[PDB]
Structures are given as C-alpha cells and as structure tokens.
C-alpha cells in the first residue's frame with residue numbers, strides 16, 4: 001500500500017496517482033504516516049457517497065479515524081466543534097453560526113466585500129512597484145479574506161493587521177514550531193478577550209450573536225464560543241489566500257482567457273467556478289471512519305476502518321468533467337456539482353461567502369490593474385511544497 005498523502009506531480013498539478021487509480025482501482029488502500037491503513041476513494045460518484053453516507057462518522061475519537069499527521073492525533077484529544085461532529089450535534093451547533101453565511105446574508109454583504117477589495121487594491125496602487133516587484137500574497141491575497149472573516153467575527157478595524165499576520169505565521173511553511181504555536185496562542189488569547197467584551201456589550205458580529213443567543217442562555221459556554229470562532233477563522237483563510245494567488249497564476253498561464261476576462265468582467269463567476277474545480281486547494285477534509293460495514297464500489301470497508309475521499313480527484317473525474325485536466329472557464333457544466341467545497345451536510349459553511357470574495361476579486365483586479373503581470377517566470381512560481389495542498393507561498397507581481 002502506497003504512503004498517503006501522495007505528492008503533487010508538480011507545482012500546480014494534482015498527484016499523478018489519482019488518474020491511475022480512477023482508471024484501475026478507484027477504491028484502494030493507502031498507508032498513513034503511522035503505518036495504519038485507510039481506504040482512498042477517487043471517483044466523483046463515490047466521493048459523494050462517502051460525503052453523505054450515514055454509516056460513516058466524522059467523530060475523531062472513534063477507532064480507525066484517518067489522522068494524517070501526529071499533530072492531528074493530538075488535535076483529536078480536544079473538545080470538538082461542529083466540523084468533527086455527526087448528526088444531530090453537527091447541525092445543532094452549525095446552525096448557531098450559519099445565518100451569516102446564507103446566500104441572502106452574503107448578498108447583503110456584497111457592498112462591504114467590494115469596499116474591502118477596493119480599499120486593498122488602492123493601498124497596493126499607492127504603495128506601487130516602482131522599486132521592484134511586490135508580493136501579491138502579502139499585499140492583497142492575504143488581507144482580503146483575513147480582513148473579511150475577522151470583521152465578520154467582530155475584530156475592530158485597528159486590530160486587523162496584527163491578527164492577519166499572526167494567523168499567517170500560524171501556517172507559514174517557514175515558521176518554526178515555536179513560532180507557529182506562539183501565533184496560535186496569540187489568536188486564542190485574543191478571541192477569549194473579544195468574547196468577554198461582547199458578553200458585556202454585544203455588537204453586530206458573529207461572536208456577539210454567539211454570546212447573546214447561545215452563551216448567555218447556557219446552550220454553550222464562553223470557551224466553546226472561542227473554539228467556534230477560531231474554527232471559522234482557521235478553517236478557510238489559508239485556502240482563500242491560495243485560491244486568489246492560484247487564480248492570478250492560472251490567468252497568467254492562460255492569456256487567452258485573461259483577455260476574455262479583461263474584455264468582459266462579468267465572466268468572473270464562470271472563471272471562479274472553473275478555478276474551484278481545477279485547483280482543489282482543500283483536498284483532505286472529506287474523511288470518515290466506518291460505524292458499520294459498508295460497501296463502496298467493489299470493496300467492503302469494515303467497521304472502524306478509515307476512509308479519505310479525494311474531492312480533488314473527483315474534480316478531475318473524466319466521467320463527469322469532459323477534458324478535466326484543461327482549465328476552461330467557458331466549459332459547459334454537467335448536472336453533477338464540482339466538489340471544491342465538499343458535499344453533503346458538512347459542505348463548506350462559507351461556500352457562498354468564498355465565491356463572492358473570489359468573484360469580487362476577479363471582476364475588479366484587472367480593471368484596477370489592467371497590466372498586472374507575474375514578475376517571475378511562471379515555471380519559477382514558489383508553490384506550496386508538493387506534499388501539501390496546492391497553493392502559492394508568494395507571488396511577485398508588477399503592474
């Protein structure tokens with residue numbers, strides 16, 4: 001059994017193993033970092049089954065849960081939030097924060113999303129590139145999702161920049177373990193302080209809703225409110241940064257489609273749909289353990305055996321997406337959903353938010369900077385290490 005996670009085939013490519021497994025062995029066994037064995041599911045239809053089967057569990061204290069690192073086995077000891085829960089607990093807690101993320105709520109946030117993007121682009125413009133390239137990640141791709149989720153949680157304007165850098169340090173590949181843990185505690189310590197303040201004087205933000213509607217009536221306590229706020233922060237931010245950077249790199253790699261996007265900014269939503277299928281920057285979240293024996297394809301997964309369903313491979317499934325390895329924002333979409341945001345009850349709570357952030361970004365970026373250009377050769381882009389989810393660490397640009 002091959003060791004898993006597989007490495008990406010190259011900087012922007014998925015692992016080469018998925019295409020071969022989809023063709024020859026779509027439900028196979030892989031070996032995890034501790035020598036344990038989990039099932040790997042690669043085909044779109046089977047990934048949807050894994051994501052919705054009520055015979056499967058996300059509870060990480062169950063036997064056989066497929067932790068992918070030693071830190072994850074550590075994290076499995078802490079008290080879970082809704083990301084690691086089964087029904088009925090899952091939606092009991094998830095419903096406490098879902099109202100901010102509904103399509104209607106995200107619709108009403110569009111002026112604020114646009115303002116945030118415009119303000120950051122104008123800061124980047126004033127900073128300029130007169131003395132050499134600037135890092136699009138630091139100047140733009142990082143602060144856009146960071147400022148938005150922090151503002152939704154309840155962080156005041158004056159605290160955004162410091163917390164944005166601390167959260168970035170938390171996952172930066174160049175941080176020592178001590179640096180990352182320190183930044184992590186800085187975030188937890190801050191959210192505790194913010195929860196205490198909103199318990200005394202609530203405002204119009206997610207933490208205040210948790211404090212008034214759940215903490216004070218005793219449905220959860222204030223440490224739960226911290227952990228739920230921390231989840232909303234860390235679950236999606238690094239992925240949002242990578243999606244923005246990957247979108248810019250993808251357009252540089254496909255100049256004909258960038259030309260179409262410059263000539264018609266209303267193509268941003270279709271660009272974003274294809275980006276989220278083609279670059280599956282969160283590909284390891286659909287994990288389960290079997291509560292009871294369950295048949296998947298031609299395999300029997302035994303009770304207490306672990307399962308990883310690759311939505312990245314599902315999104316390149318040739319049976320669903322014609323010519324799946326070509327990036328084409330003009331493609332005709334089949335009836336089947338692309339799975340960039342997962343599937344089933346646990347489907348990304350922030351899917352509409354994320355698509356609105358990405359659509360705002362790519363309908364505005366080249367109107368502000370029509371000559372935006374990646375300043376290094378595209379083959380030299382500093383991607384995330386191949387053993388991790390696809391992404392970009394830094395992206396020098398001029399404009």
Ligand code: HEM
Nearest residue numbers: 083232235236282285340341342343346347348349350354
């Ligand atoms: C393009 C950006 C994003 C992508 C591609 C993405 C992708 C995903 C994926 C693949 C999952 C697993 C869903 C499943 O279990 O089937 C997920 C879950 C989740 N995402 Fe995102 N996400 C993004 C942005 C965000 C943002 C911005 C937030 C918070 C503001 C967020 C919060 C969450 C949470 C809390 C969950 C767990 C939901 C649950 O288990 O009920 N994500 N996301």
